């Protein structure tokens, strides 16, 4: 099909297997610390590249580009909030998780509160959140990229992709995945930078982009279907806030208070609390190296704006009648959906803007991002299931058995994702991305609050945490069931949900659910038994450095002050740069 693209992807696979087998020769497998924690032998650059590579994915490319096309810049906030919470992790949550010596976050709640129902319920919630908000993202986005760019078939494609990533995460463990995440982050950044350069050159540069976007509206607005007719001149034209990152608090998608607060909550979960990112930060050689990896991942998390959001706007510039279409039949003829065809921004940029060798390179960038994210999810899920369930159910099992347990759990989660693929194919346009951020906002905030109080409030107890979690779950479902039931649609076909339900954006609901769950924990804790202090040494941010003995209701973080000053300084510098970029883009 392509002479040079074949060799470029071959060299990509070559580097992949090379770093993989280099780590095999260096893996030191046979212990859970090896397979689930890389033996805690990871340094700054692989930790940072692993965080970035696992978080970045096909979902980021397709979603950020399509949203930039349809709406405008604002969606970049999703990425940039990470730059703060990641630091919170590296400086607040990772030290505790290190000085507690846990392999999972449910394990941390198991040995910080005490009991078998918190660990169980949180592991189950984490698994479901991974199936809904993470694997569906990447499967959907690889599906779109293949359906447009290549378009030979979509089931076979993503099934093969999951097969290769299954083999990858089975063989690897944390060491392989973090070294090959160095090489994959290199690949992703290089390719995406080249494509950004080409797009800026074709539009005429930053200035050429900021000039032509608000006039990037489609011309075909008839809708021969008599129901819609002459379209509002409001939903086929770009928003006048397309160039702004802080939209209106009420009459604007992604309102700024929602952005800041709600993403801080959901992202405190997404980084500081969930097993994927923390487990990237548990395989660290030391604490200082983990902080270095956090600053690196943050600096890279300032990147996906210019590499995914602005290219989507460029797509709307060059192909407005095809990505910015509104008319149901037109968009259906262009993509197959009748909701806007915004997702085709990045794939059509790649297909119509770059030559053969760079066609291969872009396919490799997409492949690397999807593989790294799925490998992260599968290994972290292996960690969670193996440790929590298999220990609560078979507390005396050899590591030659636990390795087997995790290895097979990878196969099972792959089969589950293949089974759930059609339920993901039933979403249209941006609907999936909305749905997933909504799921997170409904189900994350209680977990977020529980971890905040676990690390920062000694008082809370088993009743505290369990009842906050259950109350948060019921409150979240109260809104998720009806809202998801009524359906979804665009200006052409808007679903008839009540305004008091749909009118409150899911991030404001995340704030309210956060506060309800936190208040409920504090309430039902302050009117029940407390937990003594002897149980909480090296389990709360107050007692990090305690050397005294713990009661174990069921370390040695000494960073040299010099490198500590260095990593502190450049972390603060990273935040200064991120805050600048927030200001520059409104």
């Amino acid at each position: 099909d392509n002479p040079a693209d074949i060799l470029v992807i071959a060299a990509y696979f070559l580097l992949v297997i090379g770093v993989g087998l280099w780590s095999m020769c260096r893996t030191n497998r046979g212990t859970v610390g090896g397979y689930f924690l890389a033996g805690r032998s990871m340094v700054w650059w692989p930790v940072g590249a692993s965080l970035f590579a696992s978080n970045i994915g096909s979902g980021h490319f397709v979603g950020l580009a399509g949203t930039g096309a349809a709406s405008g810049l604002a969606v970049a906030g999703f990425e940039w909030n990470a730059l703060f919470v990641v630091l919170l992790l590296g400086w607040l949550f990772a030290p505790v998780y290190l000085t507690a010596g846990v392999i999972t976050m449910p394990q941390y709640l198991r040995k910080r509160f005490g009991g078998r129902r918190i660990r169980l319920y949180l592991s189950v919630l984490s698994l479901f959140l991974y199936i809904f908000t993470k694997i569906s993202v990447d499967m959907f986005s690889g599906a779109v990229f293949i359906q447009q760019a290549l378009g030979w078939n979509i089931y076979a494609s993503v099934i093969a992709l999951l097969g290769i990533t299954m083999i990858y995460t089975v063989t690897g463990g944390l060491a392989a995945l973090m070294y090959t995440d160095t090489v994959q982050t290199f690949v992703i950044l290089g390719g995406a930078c080249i494509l950004m350069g080409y797009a800026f050159h074709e539009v005429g540069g930053y200035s050429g982009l900021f000039d032509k976007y608000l006039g990037a509206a489609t011309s075909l607005t008839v809708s021969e279907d008599p129901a819609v007719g002459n379209i509002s001149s409001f939903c086929y034209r770009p928003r006048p806030d397309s160039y702004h990152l802080l939209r209106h608090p009420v009459t604007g998608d992604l309102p700024w208070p929602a952005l800041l607060l709600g993403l801080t909550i959901v992202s405190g979960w997404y980084w500081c609390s969930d097993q994927v990112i923390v487990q990237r930060c548990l395989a660290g050689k030391s604490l200082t190296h983990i902080k270095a990896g956090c600053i690196l991942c943050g600096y890279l998390k300032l990147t996906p704006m210019f590499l995914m959001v602005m290219p989507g706007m460029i797509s709307r510039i060059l192909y407005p009648d095809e990505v910015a279409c509104v008319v149901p039949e037109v968009c259906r003829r262009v993509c197959g959906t009748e909701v806007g065809c915004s997702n085709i921004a990045y794939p059509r940029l790649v297909v119509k803007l770059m030559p053969n060798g760079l066609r291969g390179l872009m396919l490799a960038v997409m492949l690397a991002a999807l593989m790294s994210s799925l490998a992260s999810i599968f290994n972290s899920s292996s960690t969670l299931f193996t440790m929590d369930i298999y220990t609560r159910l078979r507390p005396r099992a050899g590591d030659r058995e636990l390795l087997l347990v995790g290895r097979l759990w990878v196969v099972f989660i792959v089969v589950v994702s293949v089974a759930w693929l059609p339920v993901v194919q039933a979403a249209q346009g941006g609907q999936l991305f909305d749905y997933i951020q909504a799921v997170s906002s409904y189900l994350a905030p209680p977990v977020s609050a529980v971890f905040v109080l676990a690390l920062f409030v000694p008082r809370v107890n088993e009743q505290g945490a369990f009842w906050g979690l259950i109350g948060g779950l019921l409150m979240g479902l109260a809104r998720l069931i009806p809202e998801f039931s009524f359906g979804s649609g665009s200006c052409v076909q808007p679903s008839a949900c009540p305004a008091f339900l749909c009118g409150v954006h899911y991030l404001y609901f995340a704030i309210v659910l956060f506060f309800c769950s936190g208040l409920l924990t504090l309430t039902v804790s302050l009117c029940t038994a407390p937990i003594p202090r002897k149980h909480l040494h090296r389990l709360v941010f107050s007692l990090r450095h305690s050397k005294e003995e713990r009661e174990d209701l069921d370390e040695d973080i000494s960073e040299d002050p010099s490198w500590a000053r260095v990593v502190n300084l450049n972390a603060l510098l990273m935040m200064a740069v991120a805050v600048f970029l927030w200001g520059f883009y409104a």
Binding site: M575, A576, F580, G583, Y585
Partner: peptide
């Protein structure tokens, strides 16, 4: 006209002030 690279400096300024006060309370309150 308030250009965006002015907003950037304003945001950096308020961030620097916030961090300076945080380090002050660390130095005194710990």
């Amino acid at each position: 006209n308030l250009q965006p690279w002015m907003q950037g400096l304003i945001a950096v300024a308020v961030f620097l002030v916030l961090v300076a006060i945080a380090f002050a309370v660390n130095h005194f309150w710990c």
